[PDB]
Scaffold this motif. Structure first.
Motif, PDB file in Angstrom:
ATOM      1  N   UNK B  40       0.615  -1.110  -0.167  1.00 51.80           N
ATOM      2  CA  UNK B  40      -0.398   0.146  -0.500  1.00 51.80           C
ATOM      3  C   UNK B  40       0.721   1.183  -0.815  1.00 51.80           C
ATOM      4  N   UNK B  41       0.181   2.456  -0.335  1.00 49.39           N
ATOM      5  CA  UNK B  41       0.780   3.539  -0.405  1.00 49.39           C
ATOM      6  C   UNK B  41       0.473   3.867   1.335  1.00 49.39           C
ATOM      7  N   UNK B 318       1.519   8.335  14.243  1.00 49.51           N
ATOM      8  CA  UNK B 318       2.140   6.775  14.884  1.00 49.51           C
ATOM      9  C   UNK B 318       1.056   5.928  14.107  1.00 49.51           C
ATOM     10  N   UNK B 325       3.334   0.094   8.067  1.00 48.15           N
ATOM     11  CA  UNK B 325       4.873  -0.441   8.174  1.00 48.15           C
ATOM     12  C   UNK B 325       4.490  -2.639   8.546  1.00 48.15           C
TER      13      UNK B 325
ATOM     14  N   UNK C 154      13.654  -2.953   0.340  1.00 53.58           N
ATOM     15  CA  UNK C 154      12.596  -2.568   0.928  1.00 53.58           C
ATOM     16  C   UNK C 154      12.870  -1.647   1.972  1.00 53.58           C
ATOM     17  N   UNK C 155      13.041  -0.094   1.527  1.00 53.13           N
ATOM     18  CA  UNK C 155      12.557   0.739   3.223  1.00 53.13           C
ATOM     19  C   UNK C 155      11.430   1.371   3.484  1.00 53.13           C
ATOM     20  N   UNK C 156      11.009   0.540   3.592  1.00 50.47           N
ATOM     21  CA  UNK C 156       8.979   1.631   3.534  1.00 50.47           C
ATOM     22  C   UNK C 156       8.729   2.239   5.428  1.00 50.47           C
ATOM     23  N   UNK C 157       9.527   1.653   6.032  1.00 52.28           N
ATOM     24  CA  UNK C 157      10.070   2.272   7.299  1.00 52.28           C
ATOM     25  C   UNK C 157      10.724   3.657   6.933  1.00 52.28           C
ATOM     26  N   UNK C 160       8.706   6.292   5.773  1.00 51.05           N
ATOM     27  CA  UNK C 160       7.692   7.174   6.353  1.00 51.05           C
ATOM     28  C   UNK C 160       8.807   8.250   7.363  1.00 51.05           C
ATOM     29  N   UNK C 161       9.666   7.875   8.013  1.00 52.99           N
ATOM     30  CA  UNK C 161      10.159   8.353   9.695  1.00 52.99           C
ATOM     31  C   UNK C 161      10.900   9.655   8.289  1.00 52.99           C
ATOM     32  N   UNK C 167       6.960   6.911   0.459  1.00 45.51           N
ATOM     33  CA  UNK C 167       6.301   5.906   1.595  1.00 45.51           C
ATOM     34  C   UNK C 167       5.045   5.342   0.460  1.00 45.51           C
ATOM     35  N   UNK C 168       5.991   4.611  -0.400  1.00 41.18           N
ATOM     36  CA  UNK C 168       4.700   4.100  -1.293  1.00 41.18           C
ATOM     37  C   UNK C 168       4.633   2.901  -1.906  1.00 41.18           C
ATOM     38  N   UNK C 169       4.321   2.126  -1.779  1.00 39.25           N
ATOM     39  CA  UNK C 169       4.487   0.511  -2.120  1.00 39.25           C
ATOM     40  C   UNK C 169       3.575  -0.661  -2.716  1.00 39.25           C
ATOM     41  N   UNK C 238       8.412  14.540  13.308  1.00 49.44           N
ATOM     42  CA  UNK C 238       8.170  13.656  13.381  1.00 49.44           C
ATOM     43  C   UNK C 238       9.654  12.641  13.674  1.00 49.44           C
ATOM     44  N   UNK C 241       7.811  10.806  16.602  1.00 45.55           N
ATOM     45  CA  UNK C 241       7.231   9.205  16.521  1.00 45.55           C
ATOM     46  C   UNK C 241       8.506   8.914  16.384  1.00 45.55           C
ATOM     47  N   UNK C 245       9.332   4.209  17.235  1.00 44.37           N
ATOM     48  CA  UNK C 245       9.521   3.295  16.677  1.00 44.37           C
ATOM     49  C   UNK C 245      11.339   2.808  16.215  1.00 44.37           C
ATOM     50  N   UNK C 248      11.479  -1.496  16.057  1.00 41.26           N
ATOM     51  CA  UNK C 248      10.259  -1.593  14.828  1.00 41.26           C
ATOM     52  C   UNK C 248      11.411  -2.942  14.252  1.00 41.26           C
TER      53      UNK C 248
END
Ligand SMILES: Cc1cc2nc3c(=O)[nH]c(=O)nc-3n(C[C@H](O)[C@H](O)[C@H](O)COP(=O)(O)O)c2cc1C
Ligand SMILES: Cc1cc2nc3c(=O)[nH]c(=O)nc-3n(C[C@H](O)[C@H](O)[C@H](O)COP(=O)(O)O)c2cc1C
Ligand SMILES: Cc1cc2nc3c(=O)[nH]c(=O)nc-3n(C[C@H](O)[C@H](O)[C@H](O)COP(=O)(O)O)c2cc1C
Ligand SMILES: Cc1cc2nc3c(=O)[nH]c(=O)nc-3n(C[C@H](O)[C@H](O)[C@H](O)COP(=O)(O)O)c2cc1C
Ligand code: DMA
Ligand code: DMA
Ligand code: DMA
Ligand code: DMA
Ligand SMILES: [Mg+2]
Ligand SMILES: [Mg+2]
Ligand SMILES: [Mg+2]
Ligand SMILES: [Mg+2]
Lengths: 364, 364, 364, 364
Positions: B40-41, B318, B325, C154-157, C160-161, C167-169, C238, C241, C245, C248
């Motif tokens: 997802x995005x 958050x 994630x 892969x680096x969605x984490x 995001x920050x 953060x588009x997957x 951010x 926040x 994590x 995480x």
């Protein structure tokens, strides 16, 4: 100066660092499940329970501690008069010293003077059964304070590290004990002294007709520690060996399970480091019939009567709070309230083949 | 000066050391499994969810806190106007004080003035049901803020250690509650107050027709601690007893499990020490329908409107991050995302007969 | 100044406190069983292993790190020329920057100049696959360094920050990746970036034809932490926040198990906080085909060529020692040597349904 | 100056921080169940046991340590004459140095001079079997001290990190050992050197006819640490690698289980960080036939004869106390007394497929 050991015991226990020293009750691993809707009112909580032939106000007893001299007797006086006031049973310290010396007889006899109605519990040492005590010394201890029962104490740990200790526990002593029970007017409790009753020891005692146990596990007064201090003081070399055994024993919580499990129908005192009414509650919930306390009672009595009266109030309130917060209207409901068993106590029980399913059933 | 207790509660909670004091949420033992490819995005994540008849922006609510005076009402104003802006539901503090004194009615009525569209939740205490409250007092509390639901609070722990506490929880009160639900235009939530809902309590409440629960477990605001502080302050002797109960209760995480498991079809708020959007995420993932917050909202509102607006942004972000994630596109996907349960929470669930297999099914 | 983020990444990673910050590899919970009689000599230990079509000296790779500027390229030069000397494969940092700006192309092309024989691995970000990268950008990155494979990260984490994060997957990106694999001359590795590959993510990737994985679990370089630092530095909100994590992700050890178990026939790099040859050994033993390192290689290269040569010697020796002391003559023997899995890693594996019996079989 | 290594070993072991450095015996996880009614008297406890053809006073041995020079020999003299007095068996340090240099022969021969009756155990290194030692060197070592058995030592760990170390352990050496056992007048013990015997290593050794094992697990003298210190001192780069292996090995307790379980009928010394008679007791109870000690014996002998006599008294007393307090009349009863296995040792045994049921049976 077997009376000197008597004052040293009180003096170290009361004023030195021996309460739970490197030991643990495992009561930590017992959790009473909170009930947000108790289903009762605090004022209708009934703490009454039976103690052999009598009825007691609270499921708590003061366990045996001292006697054998003046300042020792006036402690026993403070304890007994307060115990009387609150309707809670009281054991006395070992009566050996009173059998050996007639001057010490007064410091025990005072108890029944000032506490005419509560259960009073005599006390003699198991080693003395090997060393020619019998029916008459038992009856002596009993009638000397008009006891409602007698506690014979197990202290092989202590005797081992004691400088003048007598570590003799031949099986013969049990044959003798069992015969002495034949002739005795009151029941016998077998109690430990800070190191706990295993299921092997319970089963053995039971096979000789013993039905009443007092766990006295580790985590409270550390009797190996007390003798270590006496050893340090005499420059006795045993001091360092003792140091290696500071955490020897069955933790109280584990002992309670072990006894309740191995001898379901037993009358069981849960003692050894019971320090709050919460601890009392946990012990009872876990499987004890009544909770037992020594050291904190001593420490309060030394400070004076009302200091101790405040202590019992605090303990009673705490207990009632735990009952309230588990929806336990009376002692029976508490005995079958919901608990969680965690961590090391769990690992202990599992290894010792204590089936958690069949255990929940046995405690209720 | 039942209004004095109201200011003292806010004043201690906000400025003294009571957040998680010797308590634990067990949320530590909950791990959301990271998904390196989310699928997802971030921008398409939808945080919307239903709250009874309304729809809310975020699966988060502010749970009841205060009212009964001016500075108390201007807090409620700040909270409500921000809650409105963010489309998140808000409970109010106990409305007892407003039933007893008409001057306090304004500090509650302000909420609906400034928050016309969001779900607002009324609040009365369970003890009041034994002390002569009924249909009309409930309807009072409700129509006083045009509530969408009413929360009846369980606080026997608190009442026990409260200096002026009323620890009366007779079963009669549930018979009454159940009848009052017959006549009420809105649904009832039963919530605890920092000590948690056990599966026994849940099942009992459910047997009286209660379907909505708010866990309020230990590990957040310690209400025993707060009363202890009030006790210390009055030199009330209960203070030390309270100290022994600082970690009494069901930890939040455990409570969530317990409720969800014992009553699967429940609507369930997971609250008690929710401090971040990650906590909120864990609570929902674990089994809660929505996550509940009190203390941190108080602390922010005290600092001013925008301080609290920044707080809700932080929380929301958050939450969305945890959703991102875990590849959770919406609240439903989060509710069934992959978790790990470790340590003490695991031991808890196992001992309490919560089957991890059949549990995974119930939460999904 | 996407080039500025490149410098900042190296600068923080290298000189700030982000290695294993609030994170854990769980490698702690993995124990290689000591063999007092190894059955081999140290000198006959063979560390050789295959890496796609080539053979490498040691079952270790340097994973992707940097490029996009001068001081960044002269780091890549030191790494590559040493990697060459030791016959160990090297990944490069993300080649996005080189696709966007032709000046940055040199800092990547240098690698193949100075390291003609070892496997070199290209690097592009998964987000770019949703943002219009395709066959040609892939072939670009590949031929630019004559890569033997390409790693898509892969680096969605992180995204995001990241302050400027993407953060588009969307799932679309995998459809694209799978097509691009059709036309590519070299194989694709999918790698994480400090947060690990779950079994869900592995399985999904596998269902799109991905056969080569690089775990990059938590416990090493904390990429959430790095972006948090960048956030702090821009006074971006951010930052706080992110702080929530910091732990995480899937711990490396857990990730290795998860991937090996969910896709047995995978080629698997075990990376994320590999700091010693013992770590490398544990990772391989546990289920990895080869062990991956980033941060400690960076830190040494920054200090100069020989500083890094000494590092690889230390790593190699350590590995060989672990092999010696488990009686593992070659990489294959190590892959099936005897281990103990303890603590939290065990609890993790059990909860995630990783059968320890059927696992021991899969890792051999 | 292979004799220099001999002096350095003693000098580091004795005066530097290497006892249990980052290592653990796991003996912590072994609990001897206390018996409040032992059923025996302390004075009737019999500590006698058999050691091959001889009988020994106590189930304890001093394991091999030193020799090869004057001050080394006069230590061996002090140990031996005290060992004699207490009827406890003594191993000597590696006799390699005495095979290589005839001046060193005296520092070993003194042992049988001053200790004519106790079992004396020779010592040679496993590496020497690959480097052309055979029947005659063995017979040399044996007849040089009129040994009752010979210990061949496993030290691959040590050899690896040793600056002048010889890490060669080809399988050939076992074929040779097995042949040498054909012709030897005395039995062979295989012992480790702080890193423990695994069940794989035990089974292998057993398949070559080895029946006597000495665990020498981690948690006592850390031989990797000692060589690390020697490395630091020579500015050898291996020092840091060594640091990473400081907790490599099988913990003593684990090793005891592993050996007893994999080779039930073995004669087993349990050694490696045995520091009290309680440790000795636990090791025997757990599965060992006798308990072994090195380092603390060294430390006392260095202080003089009576210092060491006091040490053995302390150990013996401690042992007898543990026996008393488990109701163990003799060594056989102790070997089958009741234990609890907790924590990491439990997790270890489970993972290694050591069935706790079938284990309890094997240890009795
Ligand atoms: C000063 C003192 C002396 C004691 N002496 C005796 C004794 O004479 N006989 C006995 O059976 N128990 C004796 N006890 C042990 C207690 O009865 C109890 O079993 C044990 O101390 C554990 O309880 P506690 O931790 O609550 O003190 C004594 C304890 C104290 C503190
Ligand atoms: C100052 C304050 C006052 C509160 N008073 C009430 C009350 O009136 N009624 C009630 O049901 N809950 C009350 N709560 C409890 C919360 O609703 C919540 O269940 C509990 O504090 C746990 O959440 P937290 O840890 O996020 O604060 C109060 C909380 C705070 C901090
Ligand atoms: C400065 C630096 C930059 C990195 N940039 C990249 C990147 O361009 N592409 C990528 O796939 N991995 C990147 N990595 C992540 C590593 O390849 C590795 O997966 C992660 O850092 C965990 O390994 P470590 O803990 O041994 O560093 C980078 C690591 C460092 C320290
Ligand atoms: C100074 C010293 C030297 C030793 N040298 C030898 C050796 O020559 N041969 C050997 O087999 N064991 C040797 N040992 C190892 C011990 O025999 C024993 O297996 C190991 O130290 C674990 O026991 P401990 O922790 O009780 O010392 C030595 C130990 C010490 C302290
Ligand atoms: C805890 C406990 C049993 C104390 C009395 O010990 P002791 O050996 O002084 O008793 P006695 O007077 O019976 O020897
Ligand atoms: C956490 C909680 C329930 C606070 C309100 O307690 P209280 O006893 O002051 O409420 P009431 O006004 O209903 O007595
Ligand atoms: C650990 C890691 C993947 C670093 C590169 O991140 P990035 O977002 O700067 O890469 P790109 O240049 O592809 O955006
Ligand atoms: C713990 C142990 C085995 C010490 C002797 O090591 P070493 O390598 O000095 O022995 P050798 O003299 O046989 O080489
Ligand atoms: Mg005595
Ligand atoms: Mg109230
Ligand atoms: Mg990117
Ligand atoms: Mg050697």
């Amino acid at each position: 100066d077997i009376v000197n050991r008597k004052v040293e015991h009180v003096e170290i226990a009361a004023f030195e660092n021996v309460d739970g020293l490197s030991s643990s009750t495992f009561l930590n691993d017992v959790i009473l499940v909170h009930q947000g809707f108790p289903g009762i009112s605090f004022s209708e909580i009934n703490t009454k329970t039976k103690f052999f032939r009598k009825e007691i106000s609270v499921p708590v007893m003061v366990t045996g501690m001292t006697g054998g001299r003046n300042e020792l007797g006036r402690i026993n006086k403070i304890i007994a008069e307060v115990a009387e006031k609150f309707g809670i049973p009281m054991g006395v310290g070992s009566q050996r010293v009173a059998i050996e010396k007639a001057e010490a007889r007064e410091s025990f006899a005072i108890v029944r003077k000032v506490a005419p109605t509560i259960p009073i519990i005599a006390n003699l040492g198991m080693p003395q059964l090997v060393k020619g005590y019998g029916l008459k010394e038992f009856q002596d201890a009993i009638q000397m304070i008009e006891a409602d029962a007698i506690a014979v104490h197990l202290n092989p740990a202590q005797e081992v590290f004691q400088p003048e200790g007598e570590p003799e526990y031949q099986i013969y002593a049990l044959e003798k004990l069992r015969d002495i029970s034949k002739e005795l007017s009151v029941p016998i409790i077998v109690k430990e002294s800070g190191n706990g009753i295993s299921m092997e020891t319970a089963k053995l005692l039971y096979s000789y007709g013993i039905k009443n146990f007092d766990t006295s596990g580790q985590g409270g007064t550390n009797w190996i520690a007390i003798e270590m201090i006496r050893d340090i003081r005499r420059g006795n070399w045993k001091a360092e060996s003792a140091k290696n055994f500071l955490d020897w024993g069955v933790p109280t919580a584990a002992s309670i399970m072990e006894v309740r499990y191995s001898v379901p129908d037993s009358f069981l005192v849960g003692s050894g480091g019971i320090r709050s009414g919460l601890d009392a509650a946990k012990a009872i919930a876990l499987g004890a019939d009544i909770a037992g306390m020594a050291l904190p009672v001593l420490k309060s009595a030394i400070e004076g009567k009302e200091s101790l009266e405040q202590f019992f109030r605090k303990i009673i309130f705490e207990l009632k709070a735990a009952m309230m917060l588990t929806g336990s209207k009376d002692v029976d409901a508490l005995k079958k309230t919901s608990i969680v068993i965690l961590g090391k106590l769990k690992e202990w029980a599992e290894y010792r083949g204590i089936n958690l399913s069949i255990y929940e059933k046995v405690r209720k």
